């Protein structure tokens, strides 16, 4: 069962530092390269750089002079990048890669959000979209005005979830808003009740949301 | 470095139907050793990237049969043989030859599925909001496709064209559809200040706008 973890979201500041963390298992670390790759939002692929960690051996990219330091953690099986003099394009998705001379990147970390801002962490608020006079009924909650992303959302704790859109955070100035909304049988709602649930890690943020008929 | 270049950008193809993607080298990307490290991934809406192919033609194992590769040179070819719902996001190849290894810019595959109206919803601003001195309008466009769609706002009547929040998500497998999200923002104070509120969508669907709206007198 080979597994990838890496570390939770970031928030860092122009020219600052960040270090990420991998933390890899169910195989033996030592025997693999490890590279990472980083992501913009909506853009493509960037490979950063690599390290092999049994052999401390290290493959560079120029274009990352001054700007990634890969080191590796025998001890732990963890590998980790310092990604310095932080601006705000280098705000991305860093994955790590086990590498392999056989087949490639054929294992990948879930990818570590890294948010550069000056920008402060800003809890969100939650609102309730409840319907107006218009076979099946749709609601929604409204989550505005945080900083950073993420925020989870979930419906009735996970219970719901065939007929869930949750939309991309839009910023705004430098707050996020982000909607998401719910379908069910005009059956369900209001005889049953419908909650939506947001989580900001940033903030600790958890929020409840209940829906109720205007 | 590398430059690695995809054709088309965009590929919209049906269920069941093949789709063939190429990735062009500014250089040759064979390897000192012999070998030739060109990979393909596919990364899906919101998750990790994914290994489909390695040395040009190699399935990674899991990977359906349906993924293949060819090519030589500086031109590589991916084949995705009966494209299924699952298969859409975003392909890239790779070259792990020379220094710097460089992705592709990548090719969106669209699922290409008959036209579906949206179902749209509106939703007027919550209490708990109105006391901060904000209020905003939400409607939901929800479920359907091609993508191209227009939301318009107005207020009692009129076109209100400032305060507008639009987001939009990426296909879902499950239908093949999109969904896009607007959000109208004003103070309180003129939110209190208008009776009607109007969001309209413009589809290919219809020849007339999908009309939803609420009067806060109603
Ligand atoms: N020198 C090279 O072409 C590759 C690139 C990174 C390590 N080996």
């Known amino acids: 069962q080979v597994q990838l973890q890496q570390s939770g979201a970031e928030l860092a500041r122009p020219g600052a530092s960040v270090k990420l963390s991998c933390k890899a298992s169910?195989?033996?670390?030592?025997?693999?390269?490890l590279s990472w790759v980083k992501q913009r939002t909506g853009q493509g692929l960037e490979w950063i750089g690599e390290n092999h960690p049994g052999s401390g051996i290290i493959y560079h990219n120029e274009k990352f002079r001054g700007k990634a330091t890969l080191t590796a953690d025998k001890s732990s099986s963890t590998a980790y990048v310092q990604l310095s003099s932080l601006t705000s394009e280098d705000s991305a998705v860093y994955f790590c890669?086990?590498?392999?001379?056989?087949?490639?990147?054929?294992?990948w970390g879930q990818g570590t959000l890294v948010t550069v801002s000056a920008a402060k962490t800003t809890a969100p608020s939650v609102y309730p979209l409840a319907p107006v006079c218009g076979s099946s009924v749709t609601l929604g909650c409204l989550v505005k005005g945080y900083f950073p992303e993420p925020v989870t959302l979930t419906w009735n704790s996970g219970s719901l979830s065939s007929g869930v859109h949750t939309f991309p955070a839009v910023l705004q100035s430098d707050l996020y808003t982000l909607s998401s909304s719910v379908t069910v049988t005009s059956s369900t709602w209001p005889s049953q009740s419908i909650t939506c649930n947001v989580a900001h890690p940033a903030s600790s943020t958890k929020v409840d949301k209940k829906i109720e008929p205007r | 470095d590398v430059l690695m270049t995809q054709t088309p950008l965009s590929l919209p193809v049906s269920l069941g139907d093949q789709a063939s993607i190429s990735c062009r080298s500014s250089?040759?990307?064979?390897?000192?050793?012999?070998?030739?490290?060109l990979e393909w991934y596919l990364q899906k809406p919101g998750q990790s990237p994914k290994l489909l192919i390695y040395k040009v033609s190699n399935r990674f194992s899991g990977v359906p049969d349906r993924f293949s590769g060819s090519g030589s040179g500086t031109d590589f070819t991916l084949k995705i043989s009966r494209v299924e719902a699952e298969d859409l996001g975003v392909y890239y190849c790779?070259?792990?030859?020379?220094?710097?290894?460089?992705f592709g810019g990548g090719t969106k595959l669209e699922i290409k599925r008959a036209d579906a109206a949206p179902t749209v919803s509106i939703f007027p601003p919550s209490s708990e909001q109105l006391t901060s001195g904000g209020a905003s309008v939400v409607c939901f466009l929800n479920n359907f496709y091609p993508k191209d769609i227009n939301v318009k706002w107005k207020i009692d009547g009129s076109e209100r064209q400032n305060g507008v929040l639009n987001s939009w998500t990426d296909q879902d497998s499950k239908d093949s559809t999109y969904s896009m999200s607007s959000t109208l923002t004003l103070t309180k104070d003129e939110y209190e200040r208008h009776n009607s509120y109007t969001c309209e969508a413009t589809h290919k669907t219809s020849t007339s706008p999908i009309v939803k709206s609420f009067n806060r007198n109603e």
């Open positions: 790779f070259q792990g030859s020379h220094g710097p290894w460089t």
């Open positions: 250089q040759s990307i064979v390897h000192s050793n012999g070998n030739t490290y």
């Open positions: 169910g195989y033996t670390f030592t025997n693999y390269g």
């Open positions: 890669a086990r590498s392999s001379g056989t087949r490639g990147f054929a294992y």
